[PDB]
Amino acid sequence: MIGRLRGTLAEKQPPHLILDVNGVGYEVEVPMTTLYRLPSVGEPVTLHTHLVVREDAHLLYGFAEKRERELFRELIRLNGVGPKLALALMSGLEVDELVRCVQAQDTSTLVKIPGVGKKTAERLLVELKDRFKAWEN
Amino acid sequence: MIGRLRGTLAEKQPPHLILDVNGVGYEVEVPMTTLYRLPSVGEPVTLHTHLVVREDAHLLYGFAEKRERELFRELIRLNGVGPKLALALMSGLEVDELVRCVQAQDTSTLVKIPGVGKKTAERLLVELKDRFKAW
Amino acid sequence: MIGRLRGTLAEKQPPHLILDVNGVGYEVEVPMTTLYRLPSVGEPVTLHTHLVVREDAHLLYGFAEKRERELFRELIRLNGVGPKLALALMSGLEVDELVRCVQAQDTSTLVKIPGVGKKTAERLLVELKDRFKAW
Amino acid sequence: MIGRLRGTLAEKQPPHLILDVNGVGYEVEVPMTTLYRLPSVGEPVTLHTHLVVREDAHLLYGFAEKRERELFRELIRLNGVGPKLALALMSGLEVDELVRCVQAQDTSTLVKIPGVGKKTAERLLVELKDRFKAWE
Amino acid sequence: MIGRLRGTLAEKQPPHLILDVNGVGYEVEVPMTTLYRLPSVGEPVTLHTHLVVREDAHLLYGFAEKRERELFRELIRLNGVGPKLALALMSGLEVDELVRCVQAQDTSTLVKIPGVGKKTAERLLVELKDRFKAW
Amino acid sequence: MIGRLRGTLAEKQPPHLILDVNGVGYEVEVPMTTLYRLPSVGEPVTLHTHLVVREDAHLLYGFAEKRERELFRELIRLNGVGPKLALALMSGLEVDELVRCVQAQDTSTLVKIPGVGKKTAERLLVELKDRFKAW
Amino acid sequence: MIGRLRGTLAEKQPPHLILDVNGVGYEVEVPMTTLYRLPSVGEPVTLHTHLVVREDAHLLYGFAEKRERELFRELIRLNGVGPKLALALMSGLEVDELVRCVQAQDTSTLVKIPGVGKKTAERLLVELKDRFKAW
Amino acid sequence: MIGRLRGTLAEKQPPHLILDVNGVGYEVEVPMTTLYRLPSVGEPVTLHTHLVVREDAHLLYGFAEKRERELFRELIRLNGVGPKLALALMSGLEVDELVRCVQAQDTSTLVKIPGVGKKTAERLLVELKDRFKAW
DNA sequence: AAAATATAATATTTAATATTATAATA
DNA sequence: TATTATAATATTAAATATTATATTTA
C-alpha cells in the first residue's frame, strides 16, 4: 500500500526513524547502510518503504534506494527469512555484494553477517540461485 | 475506506504506480487500459482506488473511472475471481464490450484474455447474467 | 483510530460519500438524515466518523453530530445489531426519538423501520433499557 | 507504524482526544498525566503515539513524552498487562515513581492504583525487575 | 458427532465423570441433577452426551435424559449463554420447571439460580419464548 | 478420517441417527433415501460416513451406499454448496437421477427440489457438467 | 474429552508410548517418573491422560496417577508454561517435592531441572503459591 | 494421538483404505509400497498411522513399518513438503534408498519421482542434510 | 580445534484448482 | 493438421445460520 514516504526527519533512534509527513510521524525501520546516508534531523528525506501487515501490528521498513526495497521484499518472501534477518543481511553488505555472493555460491561472506548461520546461508543461496538473480538489481 | 486518490504521479513501473498524495506515496496496481491513459511522471492524476484488505497485506487498485472501480468490485466479489483475474479481464476488455460480451453469452471473447480460460469463462457468465444493468 | 474527517465533499453517491481530505478520498457511509443536511459537492464538510475494522475490510461511517456517532457505536456493540441495521435505525429515527422510544419501551415504532422486525425490536429494547439513563 | 502526531487539538473529552492532523482527526487515548499538560482546544499539540492493532480494531495511545511511550510499550508487552492497565499505571504514577517502585520492590505504592491488585502488582514487579535495570 | 456413551462409571469426581467405554475413559461434565441419579462407581450407566468443539478444547457434556441434552444444546446456541451457565440452569431447575418459568415469565425463579443476574435472565426468557413454542 | 460405521441403530430421530459402535453412539445425519432403507431400532446397520470438520463442530454424514458418500463429498467440495444443500439434493432424487440430470443439463428437475433455486441449480450444472465424466 | 486410557502397552520408545485400546493405538507422551513405573511391553496399563488440542495437532499426555494429571493441567494452565516445560518439571521432581518447593519458595531446587531458568523459577513460584489454596 | 491402528482390512480402494477397528472404519492413505504388502480384503492388518490435523480436516496416513512413519513425519515437518509430496517420495523410493540418495546429495533420482522437480529436490536435500543418525 | 552446554531471539500455510507451455504423438 | 499427458506457475482461498422482505399462488 505505502511504497514511499517523503517528509522531514524528526527523530533518529537507530535502527528506527520518525519520518514526519505533514504532521503524521511514521515509525520506519532502516538498515545501517541507509542510516549512514540519512541527513541530520529536521532535513527532508525520501524513503522507499515496504509495509509489512500482520494480525497484530503494521510495520514499515524504509530504504534509500528502490532496488534495496525490492531486494528486501524478495528476501522476506523466503520461508526461513523474516524482516529482521533481511535487514541484517542488507546492513552487513550491499545489494551488489549480495548478488555477487549468490552467483558465486560463497557462504563464508554470509555467515560473517550477525544472525546468519550455515543453514541460513545455504537456504538463501538455494532460494536465490533458483532463478532470482538473473538480472542485476 | 479509501475511494479516491488525488496526487502526483511519482514513478511509473507497470502495472504499479506511486501516487504521491502530499508526501505519502501509495502503491496502486492499475489495468493496462488505465496505464495507457496516465500522464507523464510528475503530473497530477486522479484514480478511483479500491482498497483490498487481507490478513497479511493491504493492497490498492486504482482506475481512471468510477465505473471501472465498480466493475472491479463486482468481479472480485465472485468466489472464483480474484484481483489478478479481474485486472486481466479489465485490461483485455473495456467495460462496454465486456458488458456486451456478458449479455451476449460469448465465451469466445473471454477466452482470448490471458489468464482467462474456459471454466472460469462460463462461471463468470453465469455469475454476471443478472448482476448489473445495461449501463 | 479515526474520529473525525474535515475535508471537501468530492462525490455524493448515497448512501456513500468521498471526502477529499488533502487528496485522500475517504469513502464514508452515512445515514439518510446525515445526507439530507449535507452541502453540495465541492463544499467543506466535517464528519464524526467511526472506523469498523474486520478481517477483510476497513469501513468508515460518518455522522453530522458526535452524539450520533456515540449512538451508532453503542448500537453496533450489541450482539444482533450491525452497521447496516444501526444505519437503518438512525435513518428512520433521530437520536431523540430513538431514546424516547427506548425509555417508553415502544415496539411498533421500531418495527416500522425497514430491516427491523419484532425480535430485533425486542432485542433493542432489552439491550437499551439499562443504557441512556446517564444521558 | 505511527510514532508521533503533530496537529491541532480539535476535541478534548477525557480520556480521549482528537488531533486534527491536516483534516484527519485521529482519536487518541491519553493518561491523566498527559491530559494535565495539553493546552486548550484549538492549540497545536505533539503526542508520541503507539498504535495497537488487533483483529477487530486499530487503537492509538498518545503520550506527551517518548519515555512514557516506551514505558507503555514495555508494559503492554507483558502477558498480563494490556493498554487499559498500563494507562491506569501511568496515570497513577509517573515514570520515575514507577521505576523506583520496581527497583525497590514496593507493592503498597502499586496497589493503591485503581485496577491494580496484589497479584497484578507481584507480576508487574517480577517482570519489570529483569525487563529493565538501567533507567536514565 | 458423539450423542451417547454407554459404558461403566469408572470415576465420580463432581461435576465430572469418567465413562470407561471399552478402555477409553471419556471425561464428561454433568449437572448436579444428573450426578444425583448416577449409579455407584463401577456400574453401567448411559449418558446422552453433547460434544462442544472449540479451537483449543473438545468438551463432553452428559445428561441422563435426551430432552435434557436437547435443552442444553438450545440454551448454549444462544448468544450470551454458555455451557457453564447452561449447566448451572440445568442443575438449578428441571426441564419442566425451566419451561414453565419461560412461559410464565417468572424471572424470580431464574434469578435464584447462582450465576444468573437480571438482564441475562430476561434474555433467556425472551429468546426462549420463540426458540421453543411449548415443545 | 472416518469412512464407515458398523454398529447397531440405537436411536432414530430423523434426519439423525445414533450408531452404538461398541458403546460410543455417533450422531449421524442421513438423507431421506438412506433413512428409508434403515432397519428397525436395535438392528445392526452399516453406514459409509463422511466426517465434516469445522472450527467449532465435528459432523458425521452417513449413507447406505459408498457412491452416495462420494457424490456427497463431490457436492460439498463445490463453491456455494454446503452439507445442507447437498443433503437436500441427495434426498430429493437418486444418484443416478442426479447424474442423468447434470449430464443432460436439465435444470427443471433440480429446481423442483425444495431449497434449490434457478441460480444455484445453474451453478451446480455449470460446476458438475464435466466433473463426473461418466463416473 | 479423554481422561483415561485402559489398554495394553504395545510399543515403548521414550518419552512416548503406544497404548493399544481395542486395536486403536494411542500415542501418549509420559514423564520419566511414569516411565520408571510402567510394566513390560504387552502388559495392561492404565494411564490418566490429558488431551491437549491445538489448531494443528491433538496430543495426549499420560500419567501413572490422577494427581499427576491434575498438577500437569494446572502447570500448563499458566501463561508462560507449556506441555514440554510441565513435563520437564514433573520428570525432574515428584508432585510432593514440587508442591513443597512451591510452598517454601525454593528456586535452587527448580533451576536444577534442565530447561528451567531462573525467571521461570520465580514465575512458577508466584503463580503456584496462589494457585495452591487447599491441596 | 493415533500412532497405530490394528484392525481388519474392510475396503481397499487405493490410495485409500478403510481399516475396520472394532466397527469404526478409518480412512487411511498409504503409499504404493504399502499397497504391495497389504493382505486381501477382510484379513487383519496393522498400520503405523500418522494423524494430520488441519483447521478443517483430520487425516490419517498409514504405513507398514514404523520407520516409514517416522520418515513421513520428518518429510511433512519441512517448510515446503506436504503429505502428498511426502507420499509421492515414499512411493517412488523406499526409506533406505531415499536416505542413501540424500547422503549422496543426488538429485537425478529424486527428479525421476513424479511430482518432484529440481528446485524442490535440492531444497529437500538441503533440509534432510545429515542431521539425523544413519538408520 | 573440536565439540558440548544455556539462552535470547526469530519466524509464523499448505491445498486445491485452473492456465499455459512442452515434448511426444495419431 | 490437431491430441494427450505432464509439468511448472500463479492464483485463490472457507465459511454458515438467521431474520426480513419480495412475487406469486392461491
Next chain:
DNA sequence: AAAATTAATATTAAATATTATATTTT
C-alpha cells in the same frame, strides 16, 4: 473498628520448535 464472603464487571487473551551467539570443557 475489623476481618471475611460474595456478585457483578471491566480486561485480556491464550504461542512452540528453530536457530545463532556466547560460554565452557576436553
Next chain:
DNA sequence: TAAATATAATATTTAATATTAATTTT
C-alpha cells in the same frame, strides 16, 4: 390476506481470571 418459496442481505467470538463495592458475622 396467508403463507411458499426462494432470495439475498446480514451478522457471525468464547472462556477465564483479577478488581472492587456491598453485605454479613465478629
